[PDB]
Design a protein around this nucleic acid. Structure first.
Ligand SMILES: [Mg+2]
Ligand SMILES: [Mg+2]
Ligand SMILES: [Mg+2]
Ligand SMILES: [Mg+2]
Ligand SMILES: [Mg+2]
Ligand SMILES: [Mg+2]
Ligand SMILES: [Mg+2]
Ligand SMILES: [Mg+2]
Ligand SMILES: [Mg+2]
Length: 205
RNA sequence: AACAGAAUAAGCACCGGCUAACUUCGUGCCAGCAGCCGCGGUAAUACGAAGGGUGCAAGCGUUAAUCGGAAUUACUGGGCGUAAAGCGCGCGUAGGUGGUUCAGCAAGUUGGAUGUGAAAUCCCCGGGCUCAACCUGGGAACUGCAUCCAAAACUACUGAGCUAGAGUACGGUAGAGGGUGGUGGAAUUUCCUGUGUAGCGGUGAAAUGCGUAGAUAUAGGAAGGAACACCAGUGGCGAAGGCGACCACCUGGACUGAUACUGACACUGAGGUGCGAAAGCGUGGGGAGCAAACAGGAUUAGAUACCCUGGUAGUCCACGCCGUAAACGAUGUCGACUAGCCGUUGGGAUCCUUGAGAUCUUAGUGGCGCAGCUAACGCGAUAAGUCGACCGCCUGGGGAGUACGGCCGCAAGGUUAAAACUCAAAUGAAUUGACGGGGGCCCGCACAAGCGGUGGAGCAUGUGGUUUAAUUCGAAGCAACGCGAAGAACCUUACCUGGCCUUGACAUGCUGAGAACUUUCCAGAGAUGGAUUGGUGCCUUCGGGAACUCAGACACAGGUGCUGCAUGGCUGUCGUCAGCUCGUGUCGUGAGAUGUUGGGUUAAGUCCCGUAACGAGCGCAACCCUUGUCCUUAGUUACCAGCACCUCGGGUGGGCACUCUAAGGAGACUGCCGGUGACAAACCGGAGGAAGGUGGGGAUGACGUCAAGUCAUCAUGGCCCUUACGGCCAGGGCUACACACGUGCUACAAUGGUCGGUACAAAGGGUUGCCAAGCCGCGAGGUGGAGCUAAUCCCAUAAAACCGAUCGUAGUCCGGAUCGCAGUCUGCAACUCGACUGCGUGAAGUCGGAAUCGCUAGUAAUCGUGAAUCAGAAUGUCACGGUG
């Protein structure tokens, strides 16, 4: 059922989030670094929303480009968090670490940034649909050509597992030529676990 | 009037919907609640409490009892085609209603006057008690009944007329309208007679039956009984039931024309009177076929039934009875108005006349249709439309058209016709689905063609069952059982038996202690306990800090414990099936519907032509990968055509032709030819071409379904354990074992079996590894250490095929299970419990029931090779090639 919309297009649309060659004797000693970096960084940057954390390995050290749509929260008073983490990313990843920060201008057209706001609204006890009818039209005044948002879970009920489904525009999924974003962020309410899926469709080719 | 002092004085029901007003806590299909809907199975806004809140107040609630709401007994104010409801049809008494002109009358009717309709009560305007209830003055009202006066439209009564309703007299047609006799022809059966000789008859198929004691067939004859082909029709006639041979005989009514007469003589009809299909009943006839009851055969778990062979009352006639039917147009009779068109019976017209004529008009009988009505379906001059006159009948479902009583009947029975009790529903028309042993088109190894297996035997593997101290859980039709598990000697591992811990194996905070480290030691199955040379760091505001390790105490830690029906995540399934929806618009009272149907076509909701719909999305197609052709760029470790070289090995120099490798491109679009279609999609052929009509394969699975599976991968709501349901360590266990089922491998031999030679692959792994040459071993191997970080080195010898030999179809020079003995390898350790090797022994098995599965071409069938997991261990899983 609906094979993951990145794993079919690694190639014709998108590329990896981490590029580095490794021998067969060190391949599984760089993965375990790069997988507990991403669990570390998102638990620290719970605010100052983060979409993508890329990692390059040049000759013998590192490079990391953390993407936020609000860089001023992370770079606060000239890198009081930047040099503080750069001391302490080396303690998990023994090479010296670079940290680079870009902007995510138009923050309402990347799926991770959108779906983090859905968990925020649905844990403030906002209505399950008034939160989302406004979170699609706002992401259609500027930008995209199609948006699907599925909201599944407890949805407040007693024994209820309904799925909200609202769509606008055009979203293909069996065209490999197209360009689709995808993100699943969850939510822990005072009862039940709500999972949210987002399918922002940018332009094709 | 004075004194005292805020002192002397607030409950009751309810809070899920109707219905104003809400959340926590107990409880868990228990107790309990309730005016109806109905709540309660472990999170209850409905039960019990607690806060809060709403209604009313000196009262608030329940029960009982009437009228409202109830247009639910409908006078004002309902109904009867299908929801309950039109008698089976006539005739007719009492009664109800009355066409049209005058004239009279005044019984109804209207207007007025008088007498009355007790007072109170109700209503209106006032007046008294500090207000109000309460008391009270004046008026209206009491709808009525009676007596007088007047008016005269309508009804009644009376008197006279009129002909439009109704009836009579006269021509004239059409008819299965009745009753009483008579007479036919075809066919069936029984009987007689001739010829002739082996079956007839029956049915999914048979059997009972009938036959040489001469059947069926076939010809001749006789007797008898009932029905009346073709004409024959939405056709006729009758009050309805009903009525079909031809003729005579009596006999009723309808149509149509002309003309005179009577002058309202009419309509309906409670009671009462008649005619009442068929089955049945009584007495007498009559007995061809058909046929309940019955008998036998068959089918059948069973078959009184369907089907088969027989067969009686009855059906037929006369006379008498019974009175019901889906007695149907599910529609009482009678009268008047309201657009059309196409039929048909019979009858007059007019009309040019030859008509296969024309138009108009009545009496019937059919098909469509506008207004209109209808819940809808549907009726629509033969109303269910608009209106009149009289009658019958209906009041939720069962109980029940039933019981008692009455009247009729020879009998069966019929007609008239209740109640108690019990339920919150019974029923109507129309929608979307689902389903059919209903119909129409289409597709799939779905059948049919073909090859090969499963179930027979042996071993391998899983589940059920059994058993044990534990055989740790989970997955139960296809969708399950070589399944999580891509590896159980211990470890894994959860379970069992013990040994052993309590802030803990681990997290953070607190208090002390020492750097960490190294201790090379004993006890003990180990866990652990105690020795134990040593070590004394590290940054120093030199104060210490941080680092680690030990103890104390608190919050806690931890959980493979329950819930997959509290859920997220991730996968199966229908199904790679061709569908699934929306916007705006119009139709419908509404749930809906249309687009998305029709014709053609397609692997396809793919296209074309059509069309109250016009569009859009998801899907299909393409975009991606791989294989097949060629071109360009590229030449080491790959490559050898040309060149020498050679020791004859691309060995070497060399070459960039090639094969190969991998980058980037072209090629295929029904493009072109012909035919075919509406010439429009497309379809059938044809050329060229490496490839021809989506070239072959792969990934890609729509809206959804099954509360499908998983809390034991992980994440989480709740619930329990927290001196153990948590931790630690030994051995055991999951591999036990009369049995049954699932997949899988070998075999059962001569398209074979051995021995000796000899030929050709792809794909992949390897510096914590591959482990060569030499070397020693019957053999698995042991030495030995190269080469190697990979087109180089190693894994690494492909097997079937071919060639020669023997083997002669024998449970075997077949088959290899079992088992004895002897070895090597990994690992601390091969007892329960590993894999291989040697030697010996040699089983079942001679192609395998009912059944049942896979496959349409490099495919089935058969032969090998590699990888993942991995110290060791594949008949499985995944993957690549031979022969075909
Ligand atoms: Mg007081
Ligand atoms: Mg309560
Ligand atoms: Mg009433
Ligand atoms: Mg009458
Ligand atoms: Mg009075
Ligand atoms: Mg009838
Ligand atoms: Mg009737
Ligand atoms: Mg459809
Ligand atoms: Mg292995």
């Amino acid at each position: 059922q609906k094979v993951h919309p990145n794993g079919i297009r690694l190639g014709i649309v998108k590329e990896h989030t981490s590029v580095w060659y490794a021998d067969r004797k060190n391949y599984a000693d760089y993965l375990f670094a790069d997988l507990k970096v991403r669990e570390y960084l998102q638990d620290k940057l719970k605010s100052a929303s983060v979409s993508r954390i890329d990692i390059h390995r040049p000759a013998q050290t590192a490079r990391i480009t953390i993407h936020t749509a609000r860089p001023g929260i992370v770079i606060g008073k000239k890198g009081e968090d930047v040099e503080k983490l750069r001391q302490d990313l080396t303690k998990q990843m023994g090479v010296p670490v670079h940290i680079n920060i870009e902007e995510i201008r138009k923050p309402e057209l990347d799926a991770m940034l959108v779906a983090q706001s859905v968990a925020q609204q649905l844990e403030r006890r906002v209505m399950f649909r008034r939160a989302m009818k406004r979170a699609v039209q706002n992401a259609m005044r500027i930008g995209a050509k199609g948006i699907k948002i599925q909201v599944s879970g407890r949805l407040g009920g007693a024994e209820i597992a309904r799925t909200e489904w609202y769509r606008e525009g055009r979203v293909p999924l069996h065209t490999l030529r197209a360009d689709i974003d995808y993100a699943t962020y969850e939510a822990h309410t005072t009862y039940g676990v709500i999972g949210v899926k987002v399918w922002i469709f940018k332009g094709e080719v």
